[PDB]
Every structure is written in C-alpha cells, then in structure tokens.
Scaffold this active site. Structure first.
Site, PDB file in Angstrom:
ATOM      1  N   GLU A  40      -3.311  -1.446   0.300  1.00  0.00           N
ATOM      2  CA  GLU A  40      -4.318  -0.431   0.635  1.00  0.00           C
ATOM      3  C   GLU A  40      -4.587   0.510  -0.543  1.00  0.00           C
ATOM      4  O   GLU A  40      -5.733   0.853  -0.797  1.00  0.00           O
ATOM      5  CB  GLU A  40      -3.923   0.379   1.885  1.00  0.00           C
TER       6      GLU A  40
ATOM      7  N   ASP B 139     -12.084   6.595   3.083  1.00  0.00           N
ATOM      8  CA  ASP B 139     -10.688   6.249   3.355  1.00  0.00           C
ATOM      9  C   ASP B 139      -9.784   7.050   2.420  1.00  0.00           C
ATOM     10  O   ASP B 139     -10.076   7.166   1.226  1.00  0.00           O
ATOM     11  CB  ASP B 139     -10.446   4.739   3.148  1.00  0.00           C
TER      12      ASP B 139
END
Length: 129
Positions: free
Chosen positions: A35, A52
């Site tokens: 991620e 994000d």
C-alpha cells in the site's frame, strides 16, 4: 517515517493487530508494504476525487475528513493528516474499524491482489517479536 520490516511488525503487534479479526501479523505487514512501501507519509489521489492516506492508505470517502471530499463521511472521526504521523496509533485504530465492516481485509485492494493466499509469514521471518 520509513519503517523497517521487522520494526513495523513490532509496532503493529504492540497495538494489537496480530490476529485481529483473525488476520495474522504477516497479513498487516504485507498490506502496508504494497500500500505504502512502509512510508507513513504516502498519499495517493483517487479518480472519484477522494484521497488515500498513510501506511495503510485509508480512504477519505468513508473514513477520515480532509475537507475536500464532498458528501463524504468521517467514520473514524479524525482529520486525514492524523494518519500520516510517525506514530501509527490513529492508523491502527482506524484500520480496526474498517476490517470489522463486513468485508475483512478485502477492503484493501493491494492485500486482495498481492497478499491474499500467499505465504504472508515470510514478512515476519527473522524478526524479534
């Protein structure tokens, strides 16, 4: 902050992620690697205009307030910038609520695509835990 593999594993354990909702430590470490590459300051913009944030790339559409995602919710009740700290507490706390939402770790696309079904224990190998 850019975490070491074994060092982030240690911090995640301390915050009670090992086996949280049935997900071994190796799963969380793998999820963070792909991620954010262990970088707490990682941000990424989505096509829907949301963003994000941090080590586990928590989405501003549902989970945090960044003041530029119209109609969004703030289910974790924190500012998105709180998720970029070197202290991972707010990230871990928000992750716990996300993983309890019905879909488990599938909520993280990179975990679904790159960690799920793999030998995730490799990610904690050699570590002093």
């Amino acid at each position: 902050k850019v975490f070491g593999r074994c060092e982030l594993a240690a911090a995640m354990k301390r915050h009670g992620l090992d086996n949280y909702r049935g997900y071994s430590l190796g799963n969380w470490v793998c999820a963070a690697k792909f991620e954010s590459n262990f970088n707490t300051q990682a941000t990424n913009r989505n096509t829907d205009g949301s963003t994000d944030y941090g080590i586990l790339q928590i989405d501003s559409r549902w989970w945090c307030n960044d003041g530029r995602t119209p109609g969004s919710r703030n289910l974790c009740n924190i500012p998105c910038s709180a998720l970029l700290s070197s202290d991972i507490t707010a990230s871990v706390n928000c992750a716990k609520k996300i993983v309890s939402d019905g879909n488990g770790m599938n909520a993280w696309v990179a975990w679904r695509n790159r960690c799920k079904g793999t030998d995730v224990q490799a990610w904690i190998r050699g570590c002093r835990l």
